[PDB]
Amino acid sequence: EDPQLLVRVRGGQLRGIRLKAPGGPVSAFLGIPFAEPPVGSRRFMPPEPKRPWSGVLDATTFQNVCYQYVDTLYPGFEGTEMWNPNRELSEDCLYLNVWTPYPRPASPTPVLIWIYGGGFYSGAASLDVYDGRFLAQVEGAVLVSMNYRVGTFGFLALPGSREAPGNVGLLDQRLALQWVQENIAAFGGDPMSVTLFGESAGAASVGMHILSLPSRSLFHRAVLQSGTPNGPWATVSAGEARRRATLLARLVGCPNDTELIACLRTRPAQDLVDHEWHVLPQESIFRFSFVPVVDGDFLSDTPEALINTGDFQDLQVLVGVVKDEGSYFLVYGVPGFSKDNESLISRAQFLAGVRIGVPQASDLAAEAVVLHYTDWLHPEDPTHLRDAMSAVVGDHNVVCPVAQLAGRLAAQGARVYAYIFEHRASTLTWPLWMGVPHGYEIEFIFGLPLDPSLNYTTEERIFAQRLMKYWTNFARTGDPNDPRDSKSPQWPPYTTAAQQYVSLNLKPLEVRRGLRAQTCAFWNRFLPKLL
Template sequence: MGLYKSGPSTDRAHCTSTMPAIGIGLKLKTLAVAALLTQVVNTAGDAKSITISTTSGRLNGLVQDGVMTFKGIRYGQPPTGIRRWEPPLPFLSSATHDATKLGPSCIQQFAFATANLSRALFNNPPPPESEDCLLLNVWAPSGSTSTKRPVLFWIHGGGLTFGTASLPTYDGTSVASNQSVVVVTINYRTNVFGFPSSPDLALQGNNLGFLDQDLALAWVQLNIAKFGGDPRQVTIMGQSAGGLSVSTAISRHDEARPPFRAAIMLSGNIAALSPLIPTAFNQFATAVNCTQAPGPQRLSCLKAVPTSMISAFVDGPTSGSFGAAVIDNFTVFDRPIDRIAAKKTARVPTLLGNTKDDGSLFALESGPVNLTQFLALDFQGAVPEQLVRSLYPGLNDTAIISGIIRDFIFQCPAGLWAAASVRSGIANVYRYIYGAVFADLQVFPGAGAPHASELPELFGTFNRTTATAEEVTLSSTFQTTIANFVKHPNTSPAPGWSSYANGNVAKLAFADNVDLNNVVQLVKNGTVDVPCSLWDAILGAL
């Protein structure tokens, strides 16, 4: 999955958090299931042109049915040629630019045995790809921009190896129209282009994708008022690797004027990191015929390699995974939980959690269906099988493996982060578990509420030809809940949802409760986190 620690025998061993031998099929994905999701864009009225001047130039966008849309806005200079693997530079222009079409995604990596499945589920239909991809999109309510609105800044998932803002799932029309907030979605470099783990680069020059995200945030601070957004009311939100990205942003920005006032992490945050040494970049360099010793000469050679050749290699059978960040104590720190406790992070209201069945898809992909084999592969036999079985009573091996992945990768880290935030005195921490199960989102039989299944409901981009009335209602409810937090992060986002100060967890949309007045079922963390008694100890030892 590209974000979590694997066994020492794999190339994925340099991954930045807890565990990817699970990761051979667990790429912390972004949901773009074309068979299930249909972009819903209101086309009732005629679109009209609108132009807004920004630091990126005069942008020609469209206004339609009360929403202004600007797509493919360049926020960074092209990171191509000699600028490949360099920190991003802002793009500045006074020229006029078309902003009516989504731009290309950054170069994607779909490698290993699960490549075809990943493409089919999460990159279908595939957007065009390019290294020249530092682009963002803005959706904003039209009309007067004198009243400044809250801003939702979205970071996509994809295991830091793939993903893009140019997916129908992330269309911001519904959120902007129904919730009166400004929506920004961004591209950032992924895989070997964004997280190369290269000895040819300075340590602080390896997590380029996070530097891209920060540059896009800086663009928002400079320009979002032109779209009616308030730069003082920015909430950063991400899912999966996007949620992890949000947690790294919280960690590296201290409490003195971070470029956001609140944060939302959906199924992803860093609890602990393992600073292991990667080898994939050296193997990659050799494979593309740059055989010099690591250093300036090899880097110069690599910058001249055609994009197509690099893309072919990283998607090939001999590539390592590049879905990892390195600990540089600049963009990423090894003990984020400790930084929260030491009050060295951005101290902002936070909403975080996971889906009830966050591990089901990855259990299907992970390989072993036998628990004994799974524990031997992913935990090197260090976890007693009988203890694990006692924590998941009455479940078969497949269901136990799904539960382990959910708990170790998503649910227990969310609990650790929430608890650390509360202990450090951060007010208004809201934790949830999302439990909605809909037939048209069952990507395989028994998927439940799988990883990323909340995203079409959040963005209002679910398939309206297959959705039930309950799904339509929940989309409105969940979108409103998230928007409530964006607008008023110091207030409960939904009726009955109290903060995590006393260990309160909101079970969202369980038991077919989809209305705003009953979507929250409040429980104590001790009732849902029983297996974390084991997994927290392992996470704490990393």
């Protein structure tokens, strides 16, 4: 037995495992249940807290991944498989993981809680890129990550019903947040200092906790990476959720709400996943079938309405984007694109791609996009068209929602820091034309390059140490800047007037102004006026 690996949480005792990080040991408590398995009659239902257990619960391995569609686009390719589930799929999946220093820290340490992305249809806290051992060892952080239900299981809603109220995957996250409030001190974490951080759908989830009062007392700071609660993909109206839910029911042979959900509950999980994709209203990319719903409960209005009127005075937020947010979404649904060629496209392929990238857009709005993004000096150069298609998808779904959120939070009292991440991993297996794709900053924030077996360059290890410091300084103080540093330069807060953000790359911080300011006026101010 090892006292440092025995912890008593409120449900009883846990045994963790000493794990090896490059510079020393860390304690890991993996697979801790925070909820009753949401199975059988509990499918689609809010999570209940886990009941207490006897003896010592084994907490030395990651638990099952929440049931989800598995990507078979490019089978065996590292670029796709690194996101695929690395444990058994199961509806019995409400577990969380904790990493701490070894030995467990002496005084209460700031807590980071990670929320994975995956389009609210996939993801797992157990992936290698979300491995908390480096941040625990090097920075002394207590790092927590949870599984939350995705797809139909997490987000299928018949709004107004008792038996499928919507947003239960967000409630899974919220329950893990409560679990941290009540238990994290047993691990040496500080429940008074809890920073949420997430990427993609994880970022939008973080944004949703910011916009939902019952979550607000469970954390103090937030980081949104390449995703937001506002924007075209992260939510749906109640009407639209109802429509998709009842269409999914029809597709699997079902059948009033109670009857309909009862039958959905009799269906094997894989039947639901088999048809999940068929409920989208249009051919589209960067759209997902079952996402958070504007229910009037968890989300009291649309995110757009909530960020416009919210009071964010005592909030600190770090937000940013990568250099090429949209590149990889193209190789899924857009004709002309592939990971295996340079994807040089024609003008026709670009207008066709824009209808798919901006599926809500009328003929006139689609023309406005095309006219804005064309290079009128080289109107038909296939490189510019490819890159423009990528920028359309990235700007519309991520960059301009992020700029919008930053502006509103800062205007209404938040302290905001913003970045753009422009370093492409030397280890990346996606082709060069995709640049720095959606998701490829995470491995740097989590400190993976410090593992010498992963073949990252030396500059990359040092860059990762820099980022871990920004993120943990932010978690500790609300400010990413290193207080033991004059040789700087300083990361300024984002404001609506100056609009300062920084480049995160191998060169030292450069401060820039305006986050695609002209192009975001197009998406955030002009395009909505085209109805």
